[PDB]
């Protein structure tokens, strides 16, 4: 059974997600407009969406119990390394399996594989990305499990550049033990069937997606005309 401490962790993470995820998508009007019908016509809009999402991921991470107690250098390392993965994870909430798209409230803000390719990305990323979204969606995670998985993703001690790896691991262990205990005592069978191992495998998949996205991001952002279309925060967090 969940301890009071573990229940507090879950409550904090649910609150953190709800303060940083807007299921009305009301801010999307502020982004540069999507353009479809120009191999990069969607780059300005999707750069703004990604930048917006980085802000949300930072806001979520700062609420993870213990995260703000790490050194600021480790906080930065963890966020720089995990941000793209948490974006991929949190985007699953808008992903719909009926047409393999991210539906953010309106047709203008419904993104399919063509839209992602129109930000410069290729099938080498988009195909595993869609496969990941479908696989994650088919787990039918409780929101508790979803916010625990994002938190575990962020506080991973094996990220490159982490200095106090043992302190990071201590936070992740608290979160992992909370997730395992939640699955065992609150996820009804058979849905709990190897759910933890499957969620861990999703973290492995996100590492592979991270490497491919970074490879394509580095190639795209190396061209100054493309970097010009990004945002200051994207350049700072994803690299310049």
């Amino acid at each position: 059974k969940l301890s009071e401490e573990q229940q507090h962790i879950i409550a904090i993470l649910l609150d953190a997600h709800h303060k940083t995820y807007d299921p009305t998508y009301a801010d999307f009007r502020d982004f540069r407009p999507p353009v479809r019908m120009s191999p990069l016509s969607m780059l300005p809009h999707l750069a703004d969406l990604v930048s917006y999402s980085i802000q949300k991921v930072i806001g979520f991470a700062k609420m993870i119990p213990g995260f703000r107690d790490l050194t600021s250098d480790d906080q930065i390392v963890l966020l720089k390394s995990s941000a793209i993965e948490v974006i991929m994870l949190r985007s699953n909430q808008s992903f719909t399996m009926d047409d393999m798209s991210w539906d953010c409230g309106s047709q203008d803000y419904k993104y399919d594989v063509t839209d992602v390719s129109k930000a410069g990305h290729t099938l080498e990323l988009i195909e595993p990305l869609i496969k990941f979204q479908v696989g994650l969606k088919k787990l039918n995670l409780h929101e508790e499990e979803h916010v625990l998985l994002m938190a575990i993703c962020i506080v991973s001690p094996d990220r490159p550049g982490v200095q106090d790896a043992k302190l990071v691991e201590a936070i992740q262990d608290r979160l992992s033990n909370t997730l395992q205990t939640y699955i065992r005592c609150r996820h009804p069978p058979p849905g709990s069937h190897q759910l933890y191992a499957k969620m861990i495998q999703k973290l492995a998949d996100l590492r592979s997606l991270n490497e491919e996205h970074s490879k394509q991001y580095r190639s795209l952002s190396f061209q100054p005309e493309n970097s010009m279309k990004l945002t200051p925060l994207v350049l700072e967090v994803f690299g310049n």
Binding site: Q55, I58, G59, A61, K62, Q75, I76, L79, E236
Partner: peptide, 11 residues
């Protein structure tokens, strides 16, 4: 490099 925007969002 420095990460002032990331750092400000962490405060």
């Amino acid at each position: 490099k420095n990460h002032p925007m990331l750092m400000n969002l962490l405060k």
